[PDB]
Design a protein around this nucleic acid. Structure first.
Lengths: 29, 70
RNA sequence: UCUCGAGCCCUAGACAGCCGGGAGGUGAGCUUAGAAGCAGCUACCCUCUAAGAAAAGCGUAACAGCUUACCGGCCGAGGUU
């Protein structure tokens, strides 16, 4: 449950709002 | 194209050679204004979008030569 | 080769392999006729960014060139100490 993997997703969900797994992760949100 | 940073500094710095030990031996100084100009001579040689970042790069060789800022 | 134990990593994809990226200021400064990761000395900073050293090992007269770091992909279950 690395913190950076958690921070990444948020950073991504932040751009979508305004690693493939992390993208799918951010998208699923 | 445009000449290298190291040299551009040695011009407005008023000196020629750096110090045997960077930051540990201050050779010259540079007003932020002066640095704003150097960052204008290398607009192409740098990846930075804003002029701010362009300075960070330029202001990356200075302190590592004894080129203090004011 | 068999058996028992401890720590850490892992399907938010581990370990290995293969493919792709390994970038700009800038060939850092100094030394030097020259030295551009890689003779020596000192420093070892910041942009772009998903990464990418002021460079870990060869390589060069010096470049070039070849890989490590680091990131991404394919793969898919244990792996490592």
């Amino acid at each position: 449950i690395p913190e950076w993997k958690q921070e990444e997703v948020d950073a991504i969900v932040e751009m979508i709002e305004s690693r493939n797994t992390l993208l799918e992760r951010a998208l699923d949100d | 194209g445009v000449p290298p940073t190291a040299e551009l500094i040695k011009d407005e710095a008023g000196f020629e050679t750096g110090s045997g030990e960077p930051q540990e031996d201050f050779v010259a100084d540079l007003s932020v204004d002066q640095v704003k100009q150097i960052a204008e001579q290398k607009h192409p040689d740098l990846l930075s979008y804003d002029l701010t970042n362009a300075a960070k790069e330029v202001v990356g060789t200075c302190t590592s030569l004894g080129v203090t800022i004011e």
